[PDB]
Every structure is written in C-alpha cells, then in structure tokens.
Design an enzyme around this catalytic site. Structure first.
Site, PDB file in Angstrom:
ATOM      1  N   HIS A  31     -31.794-147.250 -37.893  1.00 39.10           N
ATOM      2  CA  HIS A  31     -33.089-147.911 -37.969  1.00 39.10           C
ATOM      3  C   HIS A  31     -34.121-147.086 -37.217  1.00 39.10           C
ATOM      4  O   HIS A  31     -34.038-146.930 -35.989  1.00 39.10           O
ATOM      5  CB  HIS A  31     -32.977-149.328 -37.400  1.00 39.10           C
ATOM      6  N   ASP A  32     -35.078-146.540 -37.970  1.00 35.43           N
ATOM      7  CA  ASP A  32     -36.323-145.990 -37.425  1.00 35.43           C
ATOM      8  C   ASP A  32     -36.074-144.968 -36.323  1.00 35.43           C
ATOM      9  O   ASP A  32     -36.795-144.918 -35.326  1.00 35.43           O
ATOM     10  CB  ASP A  32     -37.241-147.106 -36.924  1.00 35.43           C
ATOM     11  N   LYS A 115     -39.779-147.586 -45.005  1.00 37.02           N
ATOM     12  CA  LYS A 115     -39.773-148.860 -44.293  1.00 37.02           C
ATOM     13  C   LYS A 115     -41.202-149.346 -44.070  1.00 37.02           C
ATOM     14  O   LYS A 115     -41.959-148.726 -43.312  1.00 37.02           O
ATOM     15  CB  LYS A 115     -39.032-148.700 -42.958  1.00 37.02           C
TER      16      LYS A 115
END
Lengths: 198, 198
Positions: A31-32, A115
């Site tokens: 995630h990110d 995202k």
C-alpha cells in the site's frame, strides 16, 4: 515524521478472530510505498529500514507461494475534479516521487493499480479481480496505518475479504497512531499478524 | 455499555475544513438508532437522554428545512452468508428490537434503508438516491460513533459526499471512543459540528 520503533509482536493487541492465511486465497497488497510518502520519514531512521526489510521479505515469500502482489500508488498532477475532497485535507496532491521506493520496485509479474482514495478498493479492479481469482484474504503492508491501511482494511472486511494487517510491516505518522490502528483492526475489522507468524 | 456524559462542544476538536450545511444539498442520516443497539446502554442514563433529545430536535429542524430523513436499520435473523465476516466479531446478529426507538419513530416523508455493513452506503440505495437528487452533504447522527458512524463518514468522503458528524448527537462504547472518533473525523474525513452550530 519523527522517528519511532515498530512495535514488537508481543506488544500487539490480541486478535478476536482465528483466521489463518492460505496461499490460494491470498493477495499481498503493498500500500502506497511510494517515495513521496516515505520521504516524510528520515529514510535512514526508524521505522523505515525495518519496514523496508519486512516488506521485501514478505513479498519474496509471496512470489514463492504464488500469492499475487499488488502495488497501489497515487498518480501525479491529479485532475482537481477527480481528487475532490482530499484537496480540502491534503492540498493539490503529489507532483513528483510517484514511483515505488527503490528496494521495493515491482518485478515483472506484480500488478500496479492507480489509487484514487484512502481505500484501495475505490475505483480499482482489486475487488473484481479478487472475486474472479477466488481470493478472499488480503494481507496488507505499507503506509499510512491509520489512513490508507485502515480504510482499505475496512473496505475489505465489508466486501467479505478477510484483511490481515501486518503489524510489523506497516508504518504511520506516530507510534500512537500505529498502535491505535492495530487496536482498531484487532477489535472491529480484522486480524493483526506479524512477519514471523506469517 | 457504561454510562457517560456527551462531551461539550467547547472540547470538540477544531475543523480543518470550512464546509457549511446547505439545505438544498443535505440529507439527514439517523444511523442505526434501533432498540437493539440502544439496549446496550442504560436508556435512563447518559449519554442516551441527551442523544435522543438532540436527534429529535435536529430531525424536526430537518423536516422544517425540507432535508430528507433517512434511517438505517439492521434486519433480524440475517443469512449467515450475507452477514459474512461480521459474525466472526459480533455473532449471529440481532433477532428482535429491530424498530427505531420510540422517540425517533419515522414519520410520513421519511425513508428507511436496510443496513448490512458499518457503512450506510454498502448494499443500499443511498448513493444512487443522493446522485439523482443532487445532494452531496450528509449529516450523520446516531450510534456507534467509532464503528458505523465513522465507517459511513469515510465512505461518504470517498464517494465525494461531505459528511457532517454532529458531535453531540452521537454516542459510543465509551467517551474515549467518542472523542477519538471526532478527532479522526476532523483530521481526515470531514466536519465535526454541533446541534447549536447546525
């Protein structure tokens, strides 16, 4: 921003649920982990180097287990109508440093989604591909715990995906947020696990 | 469960955003104010008298101002397959006491949506109905602040709906959960307001 130590597994809160990751049902969500968001720590300072070690370690176990690896990342120079109310909270968005951090760069077989929201399910094909492939467990790593990590985990749980937040492979704005997320996850939405338990 | 007093607005966290409610844009969501969820409190004890009083007054205000009133309600005897992972955390769900508490009984124009997840947007007409009526402001009252209320606000936010969580017209498992939710909301998702500011 200010240095802190990733909590030790014995300090994690107890789980309510007795889930167990199986490699045929699993996806690894990274995630990110873009350089723009890791820039806000001192790379040379905790929790970053342990973070980057345990995610590289876990990714490596994923390819071996053919657990799919999905990277999420926010695109630069967002259309203000597409960013919408995040601008009220985070400014106009990132313009640079959009790539994944060097030591976590995706190799050939991995997947990269764009995202748009705290939750990696909004406006991505993550759910539909997980339905299609019969995977219903999501193993979550990256930053920031109480924002993107927590929101993705809530979405996962509500769409019947068991989220496994890896306590020692996430980082946050503070040890307090970090401990707060894991308490929240363990109590309402999923399972907090550890690299060693996994 | 244990009694506590609703915090005073002067202790609320301060808003990062400068939204203001506009009648022609808003919807009042009275979130999960069912007999079964209130029975977990002592009804005679704080925070429940205040909560019911402040929701009654705001709801009457909403009917004078022409802001649709939407209730959410969980249905009894849920199909374990539809309830899905919730059962792991809370068991097989409620069986009786599905109706709105007596003092907040829906009236003529009101709408009730059946609720399946923490977020009032999952598996419901709410987003569609908000699009067709061009309403992009959600006023959120009810319980429980750190679970469904927060989850509904985060979804709202990501769906480009501005959430207004009235800080003295919610309640939670504790005053600590209550305050922490308002802090998170104001920090990351939307506007914390009060019955008097509203």
């Amino acid at each position: 921003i200010a240095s802190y130590s990733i909590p030790l597994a014995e300090t994690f809160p107890k789980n309510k649920v007795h889930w167990h990751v199986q490699a045929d049902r699993a996806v690894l969500l990274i995630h990110d982990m873009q350089k723009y968001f890791i820039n806000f720590f001192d790379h040379s300072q905790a929790p970053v180097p342990e973070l980057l070690a345990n995610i590289s370690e876990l990714k490596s176990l994923a390819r071996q287990a053919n657990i799919p690896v999905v990277y999420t990342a926010q695109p630069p120079n967002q259309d203000p109508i597409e960013r919408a109310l995040l601008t009220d909270f985070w400014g106009t968005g990132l313009t640079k440093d959009t790539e994944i951090v060097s030591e976590l760069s995706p190799e050939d077989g991995d997947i990269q989604y764009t995202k748009w929201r705290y939750s990696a399910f909004k406006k991505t094909p993550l759910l539909e591909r997980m339905k299609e492939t019969q995977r219903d467990q999501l193993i979550i790593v990256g930053v920031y715990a109480h924002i993107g990590i927590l929101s993705t985990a809530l979405d996962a749980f509500m769409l019947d995906i068991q989220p496994f937040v890896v306590g020692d492979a996430v980082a946050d704005f503070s040890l307090e947020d970090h401990h707060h997320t894991l308490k929240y996850i363990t109590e309402r939405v999923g399972c907090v696990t550890s690299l060693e338990a996994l």
